[PDB]
Design a binder for these strands. Structure first.
Ligand code: 7US
Lengths: 291, 88, 1126, 49, 96, 49
DNA sequence: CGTGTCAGTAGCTGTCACGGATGC
DNA sequence: GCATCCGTGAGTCGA
């Protein structure tokens, strides 16, 4: 294992001296912002406190070096500078963490990347516009490829498309007044919206997304009310009962995305379970009793 | 008092550029229908923020020439925008 | 009859067992604690008849523990006494309106005793504004009603644990001495047959080190612990020997870095465990120690401290427990068994209520002030000192504010419906300071314990991450001054039930055997069967002779909570759906009009009254004047009392708290009678829902798996219509370029949008406002140097000068719409105290009348929940023979799985309540109605009945009642003796081939409405740091495409959709704008760019001293529109 | 382990007080361990992913 | 800025690399001024180091217009670009 | 190393990545997800793209 | 600015399985 | 050479 460590520095050409720092970098301020509170006071990031303690102890060390203070003070100050840089990079790694007001451990730079709340899992592996969510409702009259969405949801989801069509059919003079029309819900948009969502598939999702059938594509149908109408046969794939659970709607924009929804993710093209090959969209509850 | 990492503090947000993008599109459309001179003057007074004498020095024209070109190009853009129904 | 004590409607009960003890005050947990804390006359008289001699309240106790304050010499002294309160600063509603705290000023009498001068100056010193508890058991902090919730903590005392070692697989034993305050001390026996002790988390020393530091010779140690070889090995393997040696060892391991003096350690080893300053076992802790060890069990509780004898006896207990011993008597002490403790048993699990929780914070503040006192004594002169100069009340008031501010038990009582608030005030949580962390709570702390019987409800508890950590107090349960929960029992003398009732604790209950409540009992009191179902210690249920029963339960519902006791036929529902029903009763929304349920339990009346959301008459009298605004009562003596009605008040969680008078002019009303009822109340009973005509059948798949079909009648007749009120707030501040002003003049806005505003820029009362409408017109001055080039050109091409202000008006959020009912304005100009930097503040209240809609969540009392899948026209509904259509259609498939047959039974009985019945009186009383009371043999239509929990109607009597249901107005019986009826398909007309169960069920409207849960977003705000869309509906954010959803996309192979989701639709700064432009232009979607979050990741890795670089295919590093200088 | 005394009554008949009390133990622990089991299931799932 | 680049390289950051990134040293521990909201010079938010708070606005207030694009102000030392640079310009602390 | 640092033990992976001076060939599902490229699977492979 | 008799955390263990570097 | 102890992990989405 020692060779595993040493041969890296040998071959790579970088000196191990980098493990000892003479200067420490400071992250740009917008990544550690200080906001003003509605009570007149201020609230800053913990990284600012860590950098501030580092700066304070380093300047005090400079004072002690200039004054020729006894070696005990200078050494006991260098130790504190070491601990301050250690807290700035990974607070709590050695000993007890630097507590802020209320015995709360301050977040370090490395804490910006750790775990479920870190940068990777929270802002890179998962992030979206043109999306909504609402309670789901069974819709027996719907076809398997169809889903029912509220008009007020589709208006906001298809807002720019509806603005474009409002300015095309001369319902609005310019795109600006078209936006104002969509925001005020002028009675024309409801006749225009129907033309827009025509054969434009949408994506329905219900968490937890256990398998790939947890997200499926549907043809949207404008329905009154404020609930999403779901087909009774896809309830098995979503594991979705109707006791107050909501679903999310995502609108593919590009031609490639609409094609992937129309061909790869359409509910009618995914009747069988990819895990076992046996059907899922089949009579299950009331339907099997009726048959 | 407060720490952003600590819970209970609202995160900062920035509005969307929808209104700005729409205004920019309409201004570009209205700009296309201008003469090369008027367009090259308004793009040097408002997009580059130069002074009157600076534009007069760059384009090799008089001071009052830049003043008059700006004065007319503003009204021509207003004409186009009011013809397209842009709110005052 | 049921509950014939206040003057309630006559609800007839199916009761076979009499109620020996009536329900106590459901609000006593919050009330008595605070009364003891502030020493109210009620608490003092209660303790006086309790047998107490010279009782002391919480504040007096703190002042006595604190006094006196002396320096090192003793020349100066400070003492406190006589705590008293002046009248309250402001009334309750004024505090709610002006966002202040309900409090009363606290006065004490402090005096300075000078020993070196022989003269004392005594005076009255104001301590602080002490927050006061309302009559409803709530506090008001900054205009919000909050509930201090009782906390389940580990009781102080000595506890023993039998653990199993990991590597050697031998049985180890450990001890913990948990004080009420101070340092901790834990002895243990490791796997090497040696005894050690950890002192305040510090290093584990040999136990003989501690024994030697206290002054015990090495010979007396062998004398005391000689019967065990492990202690011999301990003293042999010891490192250091000597009284002045192990003491310095403890000093250097406890307070490192300091010079170790023999006396410097002699001081702290006495202060940390034997002086009342830094160590204290409470009376309950001292009593628990005296019982667990069996010493001083007869001495009056006077020692408030740990002693050396207790330490020695603890080590003895441990060393005997390790080697299989089961009995021990301390030298000079009573005999006690040697065993391990449960720490989950309610005799070792203590409950501390509001008074103690406030008293601890007061104690901390008083200590912080005591330090200031000792510092101010040695600084000022010893002749101009007064009690006013030594006292700095800043930390004390700061501590109580921190408690009611950044505390844990201070939570704002759920105000959905009165039952939610009552349940809130009766919550018992294990989380918080001194309890446990959520990450530190295994599956053993959460599950039901046999000692919870009649104390904590085993049903009412959340099903989320806080399951088991949060319970509800049982109905008849109460808390003793020690902190344990007592429950009442009927004392059985010699196999004879007596009306003498005594409250027992957990361990006191374990020392006897109790009979179940539903035991067959003779009219004299003797048990019918010799062997009866009886509960015994360690949760054993078995038959036992009648001469063995010591006590018995008071009521069958003794073990359930208030909300749980409100579920009819609870004994026919499984614990899962019963939990859900009890938890959803607290989510009921107060409707416009309220209907009491036909099938009840009797608990609704007392729940509604004890909740405090009704208006009960304090004194008997006649009604002098009744109005929608107030009710005046003319008493018999001659005085008048007027109760003001709370009309259309925003009830916290947005519900409508509206009270309505019941009595009329000139009505004789007795004391304690309900003269007006509020939300979810009907004639004084909890009305959490409506009685709906239900049919149990599948209907064309619209009720498919838990969906619900409703009759449009419920929309036409406002049966499930509810009022909701939202609060909107905005303020005008002082900015850097001027001051924000609230004005009707808003730049570039027509006179049509501003038409609903008054001359101030505020929306007028009564105006209907949709989403996007202006509520408060506020403009903020923006600098010229902050203008976009396009914006400056656009300002130039419109000639509009002097518009240096931008629009920042208060608009209606998306999904909101209603009538403006109230405006409140606070102006710094008009003496109103606003936060520094604020010139004006406006609050607008908007009320919406929400009818029942598709997707709103309904539910019953048996955990049967579901959303509204369809609202058919009244003619589409399956209607009965006489043409009356049903109101609600419930799918049959979702009934026999959940094991909630109660809803079926409630249905049957429900119909019997709607129609009425008449039992055949000729030829005697039938054999099924022999147990029914004579008041049940005849019933008029729309009669109210009671089915008490674990008592009430039996299936035999229900089957009998279904056979004699009263006919309708035409003389025809619509339902059969089976309970089913013939229905007609309202869509085709053909009658349904088979009879269908038809009845009346109580359905509640839960606070999960689609009007709030619907959300959608094209674009909007983005988080400043990560440049990703915001979260939550209130911030107009988007949905999170998580990690699992990305896995789904990748499994489909939808590469382009995934890339589109994670780039142009999220955090691509330039891609999103160009996508919007391409959509409005009709062009195609452009190519995605690089996410800004990845740039941030690289810039953070750089800050962690990591040189990250992106290389091209050739190998040259490429930058991201940035450089680097030195 | 199973209690040496069973619940003889049926939910149609109506459980006694003690029968219901002893049933709630298994009910609550069955609901409690489900969260932790789903947690470990999802963790194993993401490892396999 | 196309989205096709092969390798992403990571390595140890030399102190000389830390100086090569940094647009200046953070000397003073102060943050901003609590009245004018202007960040103090050489502090953790120094505009001379990290960038201007507002677009084309320097600290001393001499250059507030867009026509002076790219001018290093002589009295406060602040460049005049957009505030976007405050999301990418690194600082550094030189240790004694 | 980019696909590993986003899985488990972020610091333990980043330290060894900086010491060994590893270069990541951005050719993988997780990496392309992070950087915003088309995943080399399904409709993202060069055969169909 | 000068500083000068005792002058001394709160909180807390009510998580655990598992592997391997760390240490007597 | 091995028992000790340190550090790692522990469902997802909500208003
Ligand atoms: C100061 O009061 C806080 C506790 C302090 O802290 C802790 C550690 O001690 C607690 C004590 C002593 C409690 O009795 C509860 C908890 C906590 C804590 O947790 C609690 N904790 C949670 C469970 C986990 N969270 C969810 C995680 N989450 C987050 N997130 O950031 O994680 C953001 N959004 C979400 C959903 C929600 C609260 N439920 C919780 C409860 N509710 C239930 O079990 C019931 C089945 C139903 C709910 C009733 C009703 C809803 C509440 O009465 C409302 C009206 C408020 O009273 C409540 C909101 C209060 O809020 C305030 C400021 O008053 C907090 C209880 C507790 O009774």
């Amino acid at each position: 294992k020692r060779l595993k460590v040493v041969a890296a520095f040998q071959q790579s050409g970088n000196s191990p001296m980098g493990m000892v720092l003479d200067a420490v970098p400071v992250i740009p301020p917008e990544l550690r912002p200080m906001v003003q509170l509605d009570g007149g006071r201020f609230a800053t990031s913990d990284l600012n406190d860590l950098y501030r303690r580092v700066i304070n102890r380093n300047n005090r060390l400079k004072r002690l070096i200039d004054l020729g203070a006894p070696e005990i003070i200078v050494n006991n100050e260098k130790r504190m500078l070491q601990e301050s840089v250690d807290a700035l990079f990974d607070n709590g790694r050695r000993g007890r963490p630097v507590t802020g007001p209320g015995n709360r451990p301050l977040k370090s730079l490395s804490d910006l990347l750790k775990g479920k709340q870190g940068r990777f899992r929270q802002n890179l592996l998962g992030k979206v516009d043109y999306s909504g969510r609402s309670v789901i409702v069974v819709g027996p009259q719907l076809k398997l490829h169809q889903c029912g969405l509220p008009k007020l949801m589709a208006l906001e989801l298809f807002k720019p498309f509806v603005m474009k069509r409002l300015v095309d059919l001369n319902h609005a003079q310019n795109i600006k007044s078209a936006k104002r029309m969509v925001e005020r819900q002028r009675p024309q948009v409801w006749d225009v919206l129907e033309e827009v969502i025509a054969e434009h598939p949408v994506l329905l999702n219900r968490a937890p997304t256990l398998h790939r059938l947890g997200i499926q594509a549907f043809e949207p149908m404008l329905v009154e009310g404020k609930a999403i109408q779901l087909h009774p046969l896809v309830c098995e794939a979503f594991n979705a009962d109707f006791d107050g659970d909501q679903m999310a709607v995502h609108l593919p924009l590009s031609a490639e995305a609409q094609a992937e929804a129309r061909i790869l993710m359409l509910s009618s093209n995914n009747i069988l379970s990819p895990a076992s090959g046996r059907p899922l969209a089949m009579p299950r509850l009331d339907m099997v009793t009726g048959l | 008092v407060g720490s952003t990492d600590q819970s209970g503090t609202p995160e900062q947000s920035t509005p969307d550029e929808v209104n700005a993008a729409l205004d920019r599109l309409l201004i570009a459309d209205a700009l296309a229908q201008l003469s090369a001179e008027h367009r090259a003057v308004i793009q040097r007074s408002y997009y580059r923020g130069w002074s009157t004498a600076q534009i007069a020095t760059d384009l090799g024209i008089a001071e009052g020439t830049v003043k008059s070109r700006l004065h007319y190009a503003v009204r021509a853009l207003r004409l186009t925008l009011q013809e397209l129904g842009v709110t005052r | 009859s049921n509950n014939s004590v206040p003057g309630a409607p006559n609800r007839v009960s199916f009761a076979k067992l009499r109620e020996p003890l009536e329900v106590p005050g459901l609000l006593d947990v919050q009330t008595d604690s605070f009364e003891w804390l502030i020493g109210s006359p009620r608490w003092r008289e209660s303790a006086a008849e309790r047998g107490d001699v010279n009782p002391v309240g919480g504040l007096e106790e703190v002042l006595y523990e604190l006094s006196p304050i002396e320096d090192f010499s003793g020349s100066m002294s400070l003492s406190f006494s006589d705590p008293r309160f002046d009248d309250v600063k402001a009334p309750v509603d004024e505090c709610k309106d002006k966002d202040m705290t309900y409090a009363a000023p606290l006065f004490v009498t402090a005096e300075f005793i000078n020993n070196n001068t022989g003269e004392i100056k005594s005076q009255t010193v104001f301590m602080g504004d002490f927050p006061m508890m309302t009559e409803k058991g709530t506090f008001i902090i900054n205009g919000t009603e909050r509930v201090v919730v009782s906390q389940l903590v580990r009781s102080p005392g000595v506890y023993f644990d039998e653990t199993i070692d990991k590597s050697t697989d031998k049985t180890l034993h450990s001890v913990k001495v948990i004080p009420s305050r101070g340092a901790w001390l834990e002895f243990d026996v490791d796997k090497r047959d040696t005894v050690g002790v950890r002192i305040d988390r510090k290093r584990r020393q040999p136990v003989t080190v501690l024994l030697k530091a206290l002054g015990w010779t090495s010979e007396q140690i062998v004398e005391r612990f000689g019967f065990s070889e492990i202690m011999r090995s301990t003293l042999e393997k010891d490192n250091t020997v000597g009284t002045d040696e192990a003491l310095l060892d403890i000093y250097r391991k406890l307070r490192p870095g300091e010079p170790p003096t023999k006396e410097s350690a002699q001081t702290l080893l006495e202060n940390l465990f034997f002086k009342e300053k830094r160590y204290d076992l409470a009376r309950v802790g001292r009593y628990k120690v005296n019982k667990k060890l069996g010493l001083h069990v007869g001495e009056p509780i006077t020692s408030s401290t740990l002693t050396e004898e207790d330490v020695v006896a603890t080590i003895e207990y441990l060393v005997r427990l390790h080697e299989g011993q089961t009995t021990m008597t301390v030298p000079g002490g009573v005999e006690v068994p040697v065993e391990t403790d449960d720490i989950d048993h309610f005799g070792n699990r203590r409950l501390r209520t509001v008074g103690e929780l406030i008293q601890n914070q007061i104690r901390v503040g008083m200590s912080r002030m005591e330090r200031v006192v000792r510092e101010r004594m040695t600084t000022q002169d010893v002749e101009a000192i007064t009690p006013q100069t030594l006292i700095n009340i800043r930390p004390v008031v700061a501590a109580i504010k921190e408690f009611f501010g950044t505390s844990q038990l201070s939570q704002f009582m759920d105000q959905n419906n009165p039952l939610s608030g009552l349940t809130h005030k009766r919550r018992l949580s294990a989380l918080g300071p001194g309890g446990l962390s959520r990450e530190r709570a295994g599956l053993e702390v959460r599950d039901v314990h046999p000692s919870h019987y009649g104390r904590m409800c085993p049903i009412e508890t959340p099903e989320g991450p806080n399951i088991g950590l949060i319970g509800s107090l049982s109905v008849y349960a109460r808390v003793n001054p020690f902190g344990f929960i007592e429950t009442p029992y009927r004392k059985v003398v010699d196999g004879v039930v007596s009306d003498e009732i005594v409250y027992l604790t957990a361990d006191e209950e374990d020392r006897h055997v109790v009979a179940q409540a539903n035991s067959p009992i003779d009219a004299d009191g003797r048990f019918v069967e010799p062997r009866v179902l009886v509960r015994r210690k360690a949760g054993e249920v078995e038959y036992v002779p009648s001469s063995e029963v010591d006590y018995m339960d008071v009521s069958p519902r003794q073990m359930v909570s208030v909300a749980t006791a409100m579920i009819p036929f609870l004994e026919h529902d499984d614990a899962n759906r019963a939990l859900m029903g009890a938890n959803m009763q607290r989510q009921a929304v107060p409707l416009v009009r309220s209907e009491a349920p036909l099938v009840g339990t009797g608990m609704e009346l007392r729940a509604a009254i004890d909740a405090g959301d009704v208006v009960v008459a304090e004194e008997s009298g006649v009604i002098e004047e009744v109005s929608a605004d107030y009710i005046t009562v003319m008493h018999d003596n001659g005085t008048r009392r007027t109760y003001r009605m709370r009309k259309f008040a925003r009830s916290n969680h947005g519900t409508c708290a509206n009270q309505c008078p019941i009595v009329d002019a000139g009505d004789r009303v007795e004391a304690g009678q309900v003269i007006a009822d509020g939300p979810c109340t009907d004639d004084g009973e909890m009305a959490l829902g409506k009685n709906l005509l239900v049919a149990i059948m599948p209907w064309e798949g619209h009720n498919y798996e838990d969906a619900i079909i409703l009759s449009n009648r419920l929309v036409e007749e406002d049966v499930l219509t509810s009022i909701h009120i939202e609060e909107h707030e905005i303020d005008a501040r002082d900015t850097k370029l001027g001051a924000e002003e609230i004005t009707r003049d808003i730049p570039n806005i027509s006179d049509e949008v501003l038409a609903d505003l008054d001359e101030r820029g505020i929306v007028r009362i009564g105006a209907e406002v949709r989403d996007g409408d202006i509520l408060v017109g506020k403009v903020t001055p923006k600098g010229e140097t902050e203008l976009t080039p396009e914006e400056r050109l656009l300002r130039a091409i419109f000639g509009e000068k002097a518009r240096e202000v931008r629009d920042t008006s208060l608009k209606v959020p998306h999904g909101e719409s209603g009538k403006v009912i109230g405006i409140r304005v606070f102006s710094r100009e008009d003496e109103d105290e606003l936060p520094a930097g604020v010139n004006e503040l406006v609050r607008v209240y908007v009320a919406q009348k929400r009818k029942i809609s598709d997707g709103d969540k309904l539910a019953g009392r048996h955990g049967n929940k579901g959303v509204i899948g369809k609202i058919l026209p009244v003619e589409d509904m399956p209607f009965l023979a006489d043409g009356t259509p049903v109101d609600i259609i419930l799918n049959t498939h979702g009934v026999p799985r959940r094991m909630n047959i109660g809803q079926i039974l409630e249905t049957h009985l429900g119909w019997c309540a709607h129609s009425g019945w008449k039992v055949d009186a000729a030829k005697g009383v039938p054999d099924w109605a022999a147990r029914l009371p004579d008041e049940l043999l005849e019933a008029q239509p729309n009669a109210i009945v009671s089915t008490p929990v674990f008592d009430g109607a039996q299936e035999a009597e229900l089957q009998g009642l279904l056979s004699c249901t009263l006919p309708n107005r035409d003389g025809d019986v619509l339902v059969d003796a089976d309970g089913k009826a013939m229905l007609f398909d309202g869509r085709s007309g053909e009658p349904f081939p088979y009879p269908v169960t038809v009845g009346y069920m109580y359905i509640m409207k839960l606070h999960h409405l689609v009007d709030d849960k619907i959300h959608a977003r094209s674009t909007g705000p983005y988080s400043m740091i990560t440049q990703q869309p915001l979260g939550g509906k209130a911030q107009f954010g988007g949905q999170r495409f998580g990690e699992m959803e990305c896995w789904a996309m990748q499994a489909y192979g939808a590469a382009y959709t995934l890339q589109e989701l994670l780039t142009i639709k999220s955090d691509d700064t330039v891609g999103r704008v160009k996508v919007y432009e391409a959509i409005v232009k009709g062009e195609n979607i452009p190519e995605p760019g690089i996410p800004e979050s990845f740039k941030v990741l690289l810039k953070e890795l750089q800050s962690l001293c990591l040189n990250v670089e992106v290389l091209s295919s050739d190998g040259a590093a490429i930058e991201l529109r940035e450089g680097e200088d030195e | 382990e199973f209690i040496p005394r069973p619940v003889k009554s049926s939910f149609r008949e109506g459980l006694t007080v003690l029968e219901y009390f002893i049933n709630t133990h298994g009910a609550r622990k069955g609901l409690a361990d489900t969260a932790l089991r789903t947690a470990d299931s999802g963790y194993l799932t993401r490892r396999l992913v | 800025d196309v989205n096709f680049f092969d390798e992403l390289r990571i390595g140890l950051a030399t102190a000389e690399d830390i100086r090569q990134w940094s647009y200046g040293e953070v000397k003073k521990p102060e943050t901003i001024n609590y009245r004018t909201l202007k960040p103090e010079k050489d502090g953790l938010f120094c505009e001379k180091i990290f960038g201007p708070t507002r677009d084309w606005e320097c600290y001393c207030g001499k250059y507030k217009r867009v026509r002076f694009k790219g001018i290093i102000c002589e009295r406060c030392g602040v460049e005049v670009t957009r505030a976007k640079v405050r999301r990418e310009r690194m600082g550094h602390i030189e240790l004694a | 190393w980019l696909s590993a640092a986003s899985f488990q033990e972020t610091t333990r992976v980043l330290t060894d990545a900086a010491i060994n001076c590893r270069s990541d060939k951005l050719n993988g599902l997780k990496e392309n997800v992070i950087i915003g490229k088309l995943i080399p699977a399904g409709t993202g492979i060069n055969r169909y793209r």
